[PDB]
């Protein structure tokens, strides 16, 4: 039957969440597209369609299960960290251009959280499935400002607490939901929700785009243990590693790992390391590998810089 499909996921790596104190129109969640002379932006499309229909977008978690994230989506048609774009004609594809991630202050997570779960247990379209599934029920019908059960608000509220401790504010995920015409009028029915790849805040030190800005010597002897000054970009002293490497014919790669210590990682943007022994110290002709910064934790690497293992 009908069903939302993701025509284009969000860029995922490279979009800096912006604090409510930075300014509107600071950037826009890009779609997964660099493609030279051409912008991009996330977009979804129904299937076995519904002519006219409305789709709302909101931010969920990234862990094992999909929960309601404090940061809110902010852009044109957005309001209350939700965005009601309507895909209601003869054309189902519906993009979400110029969207943004308000970065919530640690200081204010519980508050926005409780204030989100709550403005959702009263929806059903936002089933207790996301707050306290103890809340299991609801559908869509309505209930604007409708009171919630006193004991209810609690299971909501306390959920708006044991989850805040677990909420990672450095990563989010889009949660596109489609609603369609029902019982004459109302885009009453929740047509299965789709959730996007993880979007990693660009400012989290843990999410930085390892880049090799400069380097002392490009070449070096194979005999190893040679000091080099490699000026990078926001690395994390413990969680970083310089890595030399070269592929030997079909498949099979070769790797070397610059020597050093957190000590040698000077002010997060400098690492002073000594070269390693190349493949084999016995080489009558200059050898060329590549060096690449590397985050130990996720193994996210970087556009590499070439090296030149000259003979002994």
């Amino acid at each position: 039957g009908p069903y939302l499909q993701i025509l284009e996921q969000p860029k995922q790596r490279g979009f800096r969440f912006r604090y409510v104190c930075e300014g509107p129109s600071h950037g826009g969640l890009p779609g997964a597209s660099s493609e030279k002379n051409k912008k991009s932006y996330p977009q979804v499309k129904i299937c076995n369609y519904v002519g006219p229909a409305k789709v709302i977008v909101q931010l969920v978690t990234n862990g094992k299960n999909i929960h309601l994230h404090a940061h809110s989506l902010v852009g044109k048609h957005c309001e209350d960290g939700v965005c009601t774009v309507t895909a209601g004609p003869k054309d189902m594809v519906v993009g979400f251009a110029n969207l943004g991630i308000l970065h919530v202050t640690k200081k204010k997570v519980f508050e926005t959280l409780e204030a989100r779960m709550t403005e959702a247990c009263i929806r059903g379209y936002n089933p207790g499935l996301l707050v306290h599934s103890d809340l299991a029920y609801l559908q869509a019908e309505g209930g604007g400002d409708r009171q919630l059960t006193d004991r209810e608000k609690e299971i909501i509220r306390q959920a708006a607490v044991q989850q805040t401790k677990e909420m990672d504010l450095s990563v989010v995920r889009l949660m596109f939901t489609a609603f369609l015409p029902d019982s004459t009028g109302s885009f009453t029915r929740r047509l299965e929700p789709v959730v996007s790849d993880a979007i990693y805040d660009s400012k989290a030190p843990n999410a930085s785009n390892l880049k090799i800005v400069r380097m002392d010597r490009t070449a070096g002897c194979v005999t190893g243990g040679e000091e080099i000054y490699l000026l990078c970009d926001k690395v994390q002293k413990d969680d970083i590693q310089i890595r030399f490497y070269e592929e030997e014919e079909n498949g099979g790669v070769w790797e070397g790992f610059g020597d050093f210590s957190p000590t040698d990682v000077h002010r997060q943007f400098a690492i002073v390391f000594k070269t390693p022994k190349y493949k084999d110290v016995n080489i009558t002709k200059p050898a060329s590998v590549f060096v690449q910064l590397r985050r130990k934790s996720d193994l996210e690497t970087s556009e590499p810089k070439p090296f030149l293992y000259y003979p002994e």
């Binding site: 000054y229 926001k234 943007f269 400098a270």
Partner: protein, 273 residues
């Protein structure tokens, strides 16, 4: 009866702390100090010995010495000023409990309000002057002592100021400090690339000052070359002598144009061409 500072507070190097950091965690040390034989600011009341009060307070680093918005904190500190009874059987007394608590720029009015609510101003500067924006990056201690007059009533000695003290956090008011360093030999001709691993500097106002008394030269580089306030990549300066024969070994040190501070130098080995 006159006050005199026989040991100033260690000017550059201490980083004023906001009240929000675990409270305390140190004290102002004196110009001369080191972990083996530590020190703290001291004054020698001259021409009197005995009972009185030894009041201190922070003041503007320049001309109108207005009560500055930061606050001193420690033992016997209140409303921003250290105020206590000084030990009568000595004329030279130090304060090893002087903290400099800084205010977030936003509560900056509430403080200067307090610096006259609390009734605080050694130099009695007019409200008009107190309005001008502050330099929350540098303070002067203002020792103003009270001894006793020939009769026995309290006597207000002249307020004396100590060399300014500069924050360390403020990236522009810090102490230039080179760290590691790619190389240093170069040659008389100069044009060589060195990598410098400076301490947090500023690409607009800073610049390697190759020098050696009988000479002096900056390193050729550019703001673009200053990597995250931390790394500078310049090129070894042409030496004054561009036809050397033997090894003149000058000295290079990061210099900060604006204030002119320079750092402890290193040994660049300008070689024979």
């Amino acid at each position: 009866a006159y006050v005199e500072i026989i040991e100033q507070p260690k000017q550059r190097g201490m980083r004023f702390r906001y009240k929000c950091e675990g409270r305390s965690a140190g004290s102002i040390p004196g110009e001369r100090s080191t972990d083996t034989t530590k020190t703290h600011p001291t004054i020698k009341i001259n021409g009197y010995t005995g009972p009185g009060t030894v009041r201190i307070s922070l003041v503007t680093k320049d001309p109108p010495h207005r009560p500055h918005p930061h606050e001193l904190v420690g033992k016997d500190c209140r409303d921003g000023y250290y105020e206590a009874d000084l030990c009568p059987d000595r004329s030279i007394h130090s304060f090893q409990n002087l903290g400099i608590q800084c205010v977030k720029k936003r509560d900056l009015e509430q403080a200067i309000s307090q610096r006259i609510q609390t009734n605080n101003n050694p130099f009695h500067v007019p409200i008009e002057e107190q309005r001008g924006d502050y330099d929350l990056n540098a303070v002067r201690l203002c020792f103003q002592v009270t001894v006793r007059d020939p009769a026995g009533r309290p006597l207000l000695l002249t307020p004396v100021l100590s060399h300014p003290i500069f924050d360390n956090r403020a990236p522009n008011t810090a102490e230039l400090k080179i760290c590691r360093v790619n190389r240093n030999s170069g040659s008389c001709l100069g044009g060589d690339e060195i990598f410098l691993l400076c301490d947090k500097v500023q690409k607009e106002d800073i610049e390697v000052y190759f020098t050696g008394p009988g000479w002096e030269a900056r390193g050729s580089f550019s703001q673009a070359d200053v990597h995250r306030q931390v790394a500078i990549v310049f090129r070894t300066p042409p030496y004054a002598d561009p036809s050397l024969q033997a090894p003149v070994r000058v000295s290079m040190q990061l210099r900060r144009p604006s204030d002119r501070e320079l750092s402890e130098p290193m040994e660049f080995q300008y070689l024979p061409d």
